[PDB]
From a paper:
Contrary to most organisms in which three enzymes compose the 2-oxoglutarate dehydrogenase complex (ODH), actinobacteria rely on a two-in-one protein (OdhA) in which both the oxidative decarboxylation and succinyl transferase steps are carried out by the same polypeptide. Here we describe high-resolution cryo-EM and crystallographic snapshots of representative enzymes from Mycobacterium smegmatis and Corynebacterium glutamicum, showing that OdhA is an 800-kDa homohexamer that assembles into a three-blade propeller shape. Schematic illustration of the reaction steps involved in the oxidative decarboxylation of 2-oxoglutarate with generation of succinyl-CoA and NADH/H+ (ODH reaction), with emphasis on the catalytic steps catalyzed by OdhA. These include the ThDP-dependent decarboxylation of the 2-oxoglutarate substrate followed the reductive acylation of the lipoyl group provided by E2p (both catalyzed by the OdhA E1o domain), and the transfer of the succinyl moiety to the CoASH acceptor (catalyzed by the OdhA E2o domain).
The E1o dimers containing the Mg-ThDP compose the blades, with two central E2o trimers sitting respectively on either side of the blades plane. This oligomeric arrangement as a trimer of dimers allows the separate E1o and E2o domains to maintain their canonical oligomeric arrangements (i.e. E1o dimers and E2o trimers) as seen in other oxoacid dehydrogenases, with their functional catalytic centers at the respective oligomeric interfaces. a Domain boundaries in MsKGD (Nt: N-terminal helical domain) and (b) cartoon overview of the MsKGD hexamer in complex with GarA (gray).
Numbering used by the authors:
A (entry chain B): 228 to 562, 567 to 814, 831 to 1227
B (entry chain H): 52 to 147
C (entry chain A): 603 to 727
D (entry chain A): 853 to 1227
E (entry chain A): 353 to 477
Write the structure that this text describes.
């Protein structure tokens, strides 16, 4: 057909040479053009035979009957093929068989199989089948069923692989083959009572198959049948099944302008710098305008901000063509190993910008968030940031106008979606009472590889995105070569997210152009895959030819686009070449405490309180008006004062509403009705009726660790002016979220600068309830502490914890405070605090005994010095009171990091007759505070801590001993060692 | 003041005055243009504000995202007082 | 340990170790998969934990496959004091299993005859 | 008819030359340690993220045909003795998913289900191990103790200070040492290919089920200095403590030493080349290959050599609050006070992240420690 | 059952409704089953029109009529009251079945036979 169209194009424009006419060995004429049924042509010399193709039409007799009559019987059009031959060589048998052979081809299946292969058609061609003699009623149920089968597994027989690696998925399905459902090409023109298929109650079979093709078999795979909500399935059919309008030439031109800047950006990055073989968005440039479509739709939808969390791949391209940052602020201080790394830190940093609608009438905010090299680790952090901004706007969940104007645009790697486990925890928190974001747009960029690990070995599912079906998320597997399709899929996802407030997943099937290393030819591992990519064309240049070929654009429009490509390529190369040459009161009055103490008994009219909780409310009324305030009430007084001041408090953790150890009771539930009551929300309204502006957010987190910690961290980033607190059930379970601590909390304020104002309450206490119910592993927090990055603290008195929270909530300085709340010491009658502690005092980083500070205590009498931190102080003080050992002093180090150098040097100068120093901790030797203190103290304060002894438990691989009897012996061993 | 004043309404540099008082005033995503309207949508060469006596015809010169005068794609148009001339994402207003 | 669902990948590693030892299942001439992992789970721990997904991804890999696993979730409709509404964003806790096309049989824990049939049918599958 | 990839082809011929002459790089030494175990009759299960080809194009345990796409394993050929008899050993090499928690939990469960198996898990970079921190804290370290589930797993963690970012440099050794109890694990940091070869063979044939946490290098794989002769693989054993080559085999004066350097990683090669440039015969460098348990006897005997030593230093590329110093600086003057009392530390400044983001900063900081230990 | 006066539609018109209702009971049989032993949400049984027969243009009069149910309980023809009794005991009893979301066809066919059959009552032993 290429040689036919050359001879046709040249004959039409009079450019045929005489060397074309000389050589006709066999000719063909078409008298059937003028309706002449058949002809007996005259055969010229030099030709062996000449073929006279007749008129392809219905015979003369049928010309008068209705079409509905003809197709219902099974009569078809025909061509009267003649073959006038030369008898001097060709005989009747050969010419008769030659025409028979032609007939066999024109009705063959392999003939059309070969033609469809050459024309780039992946679908099964029509086969010559003789009419099914079944009635229309019998055929109807087959056609109804075939329609349902196409919706359930239409995505499997879809042309969504741009590399066309598996050619068998288009033929390995009898549930989608029409011939299998008792149907033939004769039934194609018959009407079937398809109840609400394309809206129409009656449709011709050829229309029914073409609708299903353009809806579920084209470049968009639709998987929506698994969704449990019915209106959502009805909704997707109203969009997918409609014969979609071809986009305008102006819309197509904006797609090509967005693809010109994306292909030129990666052209510049793979030229200007080296080592950029990794992070090369070549092949997936289509994801740049895909995100643009999401954000253009969002602005049209009346939304405020789109927060993007994405991995290292093509991140600089997004920063310039999507966020809206100039090339100048991108390559300011930019930086050849065989292994991949981080390169310039811009690949981690998150900058903000603004998006102006090209065709619409609105402008929307586009911000990017910081993430480490750990794939999908940012997922819960982004959903926490989006929720922080929504709550701030009096919109979404915590607001009068539940719009959810902040939209999370989360991008992911192909193998990283099915691979990582965080992916599931994040989906679980996408629709919770105090965690929902009202839907999230997920764009997985399936490059069909992961370094050298085959996608087959990286997932146990057909699609990578099959994890999303946990929450009924519709999946649209779209081809990354068709940009017009990618935009439609992206814009449709926005409509779904705005209509149902549910996460949507777009699988962009593309190809990775080059390996992750500069000297990496991954054709060692996948030779067949990279053999195809070798012969592939750029997703911008290929789309350019398609618009010319389809008659959408002209050669003048091809010059407008080609000049724009060079105009944007020169734009960044010259801008970079030019820019290179130029190179506090922490206490409240007692009347505030009495307001919080009365809020526990300010129950609504007819609120039947549970009898086990009922006396706790009355006890807190007594504590706020007299004293002996336990840790449980002190915790609520610290936050209760901050809410009444006007600050937002977000306390949420595993069973934190009631309290892990029945101590918080921030939410009390009616025994008869089941209504919830929050006493801390009463403080958000001043006595004069005026709202303070503060708010109390208390929720119960799922059985998650990684995402529970990552969400609260993201909240303190999205809203710094918020007291964000996360309480674990037991400190020991924090190792699940170790990536959030190591990569986001400790090194957050430093690697990038994302200031963390999060408080991590970790129940720590040596009681012997097992290794997983005792030590919250302090040794690790101290091990990753740098000068001014975190604030590790271990309070001993309820008053000190009160000042600690108030100090961290009103310091202004964004620094993560890791508090270690006690477990048994909550109900300890000794661990109480008077009113004068909460009113006439400040936070104490170092704490002396009560006899030396307030009572009549002799500091000279002290010879033996004890240094401690946890509840162990109360056991050492009672042991001292039993033996009247006036030679032993106990000092507490409340702030473990930074070490209170000045507060401790001044305090150590008191008690001058001290001749021995000890660090008494319940934790083992290799664990606790000794591994850091025993090496820091004689190096920082050698005038006192030189020759420091250690009175602690033996070193174990687990935080504590399994048997409860063993713990009692070991706890008494340390008490006798420090008192002998 | 005797000549046309284009004031950008939508764009990064919104609320800016420019004067078309020459037989040829150049606009585009390149510094070799009098009105350097910078953005990824805008092409290197976009449109000209030619002045013929007492007439201002804003003419397109091979741009990908065309030139829309009052949301209408044109190749040559005699711009009148108060028109939405669009170059990529930018939208300016004519004044006489 | 006390960490819920933490032993999930450890059990599937133990079952695979014994399958390879017996010259059956994935590594050997036979393909019996004679070692069957009976994994029991907490109601909020199936949807709430992330390891659950990583573990299901391993259930059918070239050198990780165990040839199927019987999972018996004990949905007691509670987790200490957290309601299942605040513990999962799906109708069932077991909706996580849908990742690999795992058939889910929501049976009543009061009818014993039904529980036995459901359990025995799972073995057949 | 196996058409090998031309990029892989010379690496096959180089390993034929290395086994018959010497200068065996870390990459071939790794396969020789397991290749001998398979031929002996032991099961080897090496699987990790992109471990089949090798994270840094070094393993090549499986090579794929360029024309056909067939897989070829050279270590499985050793499972059959020359006389046709099968040895009983097997090589299991797979590419794990983008999983951390389950990838580590699966290999651990394999060493419990089959103790008589060399189970090895290789991370892409050591820094990504924090995802599976629950498997390390609850099953590996406290497994052999809380319940008694004996772990015979080997965790290869690519560790090397090159400056490719905080998530592509330090595998956080400080934490492994922090949770180490008397005889629960075996943390190790090899410096020579021969030592790593004996380390794996020793752990694979000791009988004692103990998790060996090996820290494989990244750049030092292709380092021309980090090689080993045949004499090391044949006429030698595992060395928990390692002296310089001039004092042990060459003509080296032990008395000339006044300045004593203690190190562990690839940093030794930079300190030895700096010493060779300035001919500083007063500086000796001893390596602590087995970090835990500390080789008390092997080090006391070695510390008695070089008697004119008047100063001791611990030189590590890792920051001050990270690396080995937080444990060593408090253990060494308490266990061996006759030598390590008054030990000085030559290392990087304390950071909250394992390394600095910019590559230029790493070059300055790495040179600062080299000039501090040589002045 | 509710007193509803006969649907004047033909059997052909009623057939496609009955075919669709069978698939609707297969997709969400679990959503209206008695699998909650505490019977906390009594509305789950009534909050589903895709399973309500009256919604699919059917009455108690159509209960004794034959419908061309393509391979429902093996039989190509069945009375409506028989069709709704198989679906009740198979899905809405104490075993909710989520087998329609699986992509392998023979697996769906397999569960269909083991679920849509009047299963024998277990022996007294
Ligand atoms: C948590 C984590 N573990 C390991 C790595 C090392 N790594 C870098 S690229 C890669 C595979 C790429 O997978 P995918 O997410 O599909 O990225 P893409 O191939 O699309 O670039 C891996 C394992 C990582 N970056 N993050
Ligand atoms: C990983 C982990 N985090 C926290 C806890 C603390 N905890 C003890 S009981 C409980 C809730 C129980 O939930 P579930 O898994 O539904 O238990 P079930 O009663 O169904 O067995 C929690 C959070 C735990 N045991 N494991
Ligand atoms: Ca603050
Ligand atoms: Ca062994
Ligand atoms: Mg990928
Ligand atoms: Mg429970």
């Amino acid at each position: 057909i290429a040689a036919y169209e050359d001879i046709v194009r040249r004959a039409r424009d009079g450019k045929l040479t005489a060397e074309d006419f000389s050589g006709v060995t066999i000719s063909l004429t078409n008298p059937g053009t003028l309706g002449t049924v058949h002809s007996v042509p005259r055969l010229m010399q030099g030709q062996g035979a000449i073929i006279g193709a007749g008129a392809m039409e219905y015979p003369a007799e049928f010309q008068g009957a209705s079409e509905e009559r003809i197709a219902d019987l099974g009569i078809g059009k025909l061509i009267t093929l003649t073959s006038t031959y030369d008898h001097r060589i060709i005989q009747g048998a050969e010419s008769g068989d030659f025409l028979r052979t032609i007939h066999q081809l024109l009705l063959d299946d392999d003939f059309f199989d070969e033609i469809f292969r050459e024309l780039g058609i992946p679908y099964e061609p029509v086969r010559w089948r003789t009419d099914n003699p079944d009635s229309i009623e019998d055929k109807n149920a087959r056609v109804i069923e075939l329609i349902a089968a196409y919706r359930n597994r239409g995505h499997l027989m879809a042309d969504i692989d741009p590399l066309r690696l598996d050619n068998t998925r288009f033929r390995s399905h009898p549930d989608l083959d029409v011939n299998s459902h008792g149907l033939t090409l004769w039934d194609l023109d018959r009407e079937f009572k398809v109840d609400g298929f394309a809206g129409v109650q009656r449709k011709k079979l050829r229309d029914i198959l073409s609708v299903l093709r353009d809806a579920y078999c084209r470049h968009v795979g639709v998987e929506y049948t698994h969704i449990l909500e019915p209106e959502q399935q009805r909704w997707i059919q109203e969009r997918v099944e409609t014969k979609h309008d071809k986009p305008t030439v102006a819309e197509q031109k904006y797609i090509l302008s967005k693809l010109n800047a994306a292909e030129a950006f990666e052209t510049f990055l793979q030229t200007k710098y080296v080592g950029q073989k990794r992070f090369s968005l070549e092949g997936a440039e289509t994801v740049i305008p895909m995100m643009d479509a999401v954000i253009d739709q969002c602005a049209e939808h009346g939304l405020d901000e789109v927060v993007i969390a994405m991995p290292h791949r093509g991140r600089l391209n997004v920063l310039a063509n999507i966020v809206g940052k100039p090339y100048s602020q991108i390559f300011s201080e930019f930086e050849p190993s065989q292994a991949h790394g981080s390169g310039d830190v811009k690949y981690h940093l998150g900058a903000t910008g603004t998006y102006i609608q090209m065709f619409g009438d609105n402008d929307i905010e586009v911000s990017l968030t910081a993430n480490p090299s750990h794939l999908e680790a940012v997922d819960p952090v982004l959903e926490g940031l989006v929720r922080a901004k929504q709550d701030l706007l009096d919109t979404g969940e915590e607001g009068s106008d539940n719009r959810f104007s902040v939209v999370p645009l989360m991008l992911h790697g192909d193998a990283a979606f099915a691979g990582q486990g965080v992916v599931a925890e994040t989906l679980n928190l996408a629709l919770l009472r105090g965690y929902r974001t009202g839907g999230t747009i997920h764009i997985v960029v399936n490059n069909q590889i992961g370094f050298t690990t085959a996608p087959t070995d990286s997932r146990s599912s057909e699609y990578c995105t099959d994890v999303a079906k946990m929450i009924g998320a519709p999946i649209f597997h779209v081809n990354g070569d068709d940009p017009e399709a990618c935009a439609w899929v992206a814009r449709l996802a926005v409509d779904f997210r705005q209509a149902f407030k549910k996460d949507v997943v777009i699988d962009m099937l593309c190809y990775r152009r080059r390996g992750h290393n500069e000297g990496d030819d991954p054709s060692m591992t996948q030779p067949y895959m990279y053999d195809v990519i070798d012969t592939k064309r750029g997703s911008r240049k290929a789309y350019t030819e398609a618009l010319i070929g389809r008659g959408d654009i002209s050669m003048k429009e091809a010059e407008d686009a080609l000049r724009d490509y060079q105009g944007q390529l020169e734009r960044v190369f010259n801008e970079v070449r030019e820019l290179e040459k130029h190179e506090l009161a922490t206490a409240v009055d007692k009347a505030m405490l009495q307001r919080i103490g009365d809020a526990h008994l300010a129950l609504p009219e007819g609120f039947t309180v549970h009898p086990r909780v009922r006396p706790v409310l009355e006890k807190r009324r007594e504590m706020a008006y007299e004293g002996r305030i336990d840790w449980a009430f002190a915790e609520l007084l610290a936050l209760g004062s901050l809410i009444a001041e006007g600050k937002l408090v977000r306390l949420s953790g595993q069973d934190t509403q009631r309290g892990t150890f029945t101590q918080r009771h921030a939410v009390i539930v009616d025994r008869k009705t089941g209504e919830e009551f929050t006493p801390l929300q009463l403080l958000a309204t001043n006595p004069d009726g005026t709202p303070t502006g503060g708010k109390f957010l208390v929720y119960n987190s799922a059985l998650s660790e990684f995402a529970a910690v990552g969400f609260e961290y993201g909240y303190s980033v999205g809203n710094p002016d918020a007291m964000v607190l996360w309480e674990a059930q037991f400190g020991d379970f924090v190792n699940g979220a170790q990536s959030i601590i190591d990569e986001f909390i400790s090194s957050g304020e430093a690697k990038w600068g994302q200031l963390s104002d999060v408080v991590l309450l970790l129940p720590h206490g040596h009681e012997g309830q097992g290794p997983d119910h005792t030590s919250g592993r302090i040794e690790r927090f101290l091990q990753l502490w740098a000068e001014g990055s975190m604030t590790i603290a271990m309070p001993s008195t309820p008053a000190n914890y009160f000042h600690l929270l108030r100090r961290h909530g009103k310091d202004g300085i964004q620094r993560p405070l890791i508090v270690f709340t006690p477990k048994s010491m909550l109900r300890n009658k000794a661990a109480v605090s008077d009113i004068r502690d909460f009113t006439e005092s400040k936070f104490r980083s170092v704490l002396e005994e009560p006899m030396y500070t307030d009572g009549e205590g002799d500091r000279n009498k002290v010879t033996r010095l004890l240094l401690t931190s946890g509840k162990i102080y109360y056991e050492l003080a009672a042991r001292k009171a039993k033996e009247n050992r006036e030679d032993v002093a106990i000092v507490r180090i409340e702030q473990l990091a930074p070490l209170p150098r000045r507060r401790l040097a001044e305090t150590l100068d008191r008690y001058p007759n001290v001749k021995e120093k000890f660090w008494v901790q319940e934790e083992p030797a290799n664990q606790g505070a000794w591994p850091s203190f025993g090496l820091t103290l004689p190096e920082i304060l050698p005038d006192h801590f030189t020759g420091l002894k250690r009175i602690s438990r033996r070193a174990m691989s687990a935080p504590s001993s399994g048997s409860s009897k063993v713990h009692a012996v070991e706890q008494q061993e340390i008490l006798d060692t420090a008192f002998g | 003041s005797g000549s046309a004043l284009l004031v950008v309404k939508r764009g990064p540099n919104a609320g800016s005055r420019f004067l078309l008082d020459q037989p040829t005033t150049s606009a585009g995503r390149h510094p070799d243009s009098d009105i350097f309207l910078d953005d990824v949508t805008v092409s290197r060469r976009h449109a000209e504000f030619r002045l013929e006596g007492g007439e201002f015809q804003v003419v397109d010169v091979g741009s990908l995202n065309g030139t829309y005068v009052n949301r209408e794609p044109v190749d040559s148009a005699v711009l009148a007082n108060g028109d939405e001339v669009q170059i990529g994402k930018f939208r300016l207003v004519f004044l006489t």
